[PDB]
Design a protein around this ligand. Structure first.
Ligand SMILES: Nc1ncnc2c1ncn2[C@@H]1O[C@@H]2COP(=O)(O)O[C@H]2[C@H]1O
Length: 359
């Protein structure tokens, strides 16, 4: 019943052809098949991991950790403040730190939610559209609020109950290099999910796309039920908020940004002015020495696997994995994973090395 199905499906996984038929029958009896709708989260970062997954149809996207955004109320200015560090990989190895200093002030006169101290967890995947000739960035992002212990007996939030279209506009000036970016896409606050594509409309971007991610809509963060009273960003909608930043690149220049974030009709719009000063023309930013996505460069399609890191290390999921298309999965529980690795040292090696490479 399920076995004839999983037996048919397991043919799409060439890793298992490293296996005799009697044993393969036993493995297929332990596999569980799953159809996953396009866009759905399969594994969430920080969750415990009791199984791993083999892709039989479709592809999945891995979104890796970008860090935490630490937020505090600014009750006297009726807004919030945030500070955090971004670690950009340098292409030859090493890291370029970007220290972020942030303040947000509502545009409207009405009261907003002024939160207790908390943070936003961000995971991201950066990619390219193989049919796009312009300089561009395709971006997938998950944003989750956390840091308030869950005791256990805003009107702006109802603007984000579904999928909201987003428009992003940036005029930049870095060491006199002027440039513009336009981006469009959609925000799903219910799942904390951003999917956008950005174009440099003036030609070649004079800085690396990863350094513009933070500047290019925290109102799409998923605030958990017990934290809805701490979501300043949605509470200031629809009139919106001003968001300003100082971004200090260690041993290099600084970005200063001012943005208007607000609804125009049904569309959440983010309009940005950015000025960069004191950059080194042969440094990591103006010299384009930062990795775009070498860490995590591809969706994982048929024959690939994920979820193996937690089973090897015992640590929680290190990344969020979501279906890019409709996905057909076979999952394998932890205990049967250890037996698979024991029965086939070849397969054990493939897992070991892949998990190392991904670490
Ligand atoms: N840089 C990466 N490239 C590809 N896949 C990854 C990367 N980082 C994590 N993963 C996968 O994402 C999974 C998330 O859950 P696990 O940590 O159990 O195991 C992880 C790997 O399978």
């Amino acid at each position: 019943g399920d076995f004839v199905r999983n037996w048919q499906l397991v043919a799409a996984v060439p890793l298992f052809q490293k296996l005799g038929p009697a044993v393969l029958v036993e493995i297929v009896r332990a596999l569980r098949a799953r159809t996953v709708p396009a866009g759905a989260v399969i594994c969430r970062i920080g969750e415990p991991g009791d199984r791993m997954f083999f892709v039989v149809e479709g592809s999945v996207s891995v979104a890796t950790n970008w860090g935490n955004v630490y937020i505090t109320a600014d009750k006297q200015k009726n807004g919030i403040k945030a500070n955090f560090k971004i670690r950009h990989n340098v292409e030859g190895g090493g890291v370029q730190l970007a220290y972020h200093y942030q303040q947000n002030t509502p545009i409207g006169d009405g009261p907003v939610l002024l939160p207790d101290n908390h943070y936003l967890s961000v995971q991201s995947k950066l990619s390219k559209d193989p049919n796009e000739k312009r300089d561009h960035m395709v971006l997938l992002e998950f944003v989750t609020a956390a840091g308030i212990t869950l005791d256990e007996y805003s009107k702006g939030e109802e603007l984000f109950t579904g999928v909201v279209p987003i428009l992003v506009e940036l005029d930049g000036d870095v060491n006199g290099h002027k440039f513009s970016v336009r981006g469009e896409g959609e925000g799903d606050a219910t799942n904390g999910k951003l999917t956008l594509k950005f174009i440099c409309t003036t030609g070649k971007l004079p800085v690396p796309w990863p350094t513009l991610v933070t500047t290019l809509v925290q109102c799409f963060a998923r605030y958990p039920d017990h934290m809805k009273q701490h979501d300043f960003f949605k509470s200031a909608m629809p009139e919106g908020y001003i968001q300003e930043r100082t971004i200090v690149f260690k041993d290099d220049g600084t970005y200063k940004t001012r943005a208007e974030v607000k609804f125009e009709g049904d569309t959440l719009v983010n309009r940005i002015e950015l000025k960069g000063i004191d950059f080194k023309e042969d440094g990591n930013i103006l010299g384009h020495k930062l990795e775009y996505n070498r860490v995590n460069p591809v969706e994982l399609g048929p024959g690939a696997f994920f979820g193996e890191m937690a089973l090897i290390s015992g640590e929680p999921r290190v990344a969020t994995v979501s279906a890019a298309t409709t996905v057909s999965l076979l999952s394998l529980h932890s205990a049967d994973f250890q037996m698979l690795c024991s029965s086939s040292p070849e397969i054990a090696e493939i897992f070991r090395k892949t998990a190392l490479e991904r670490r």
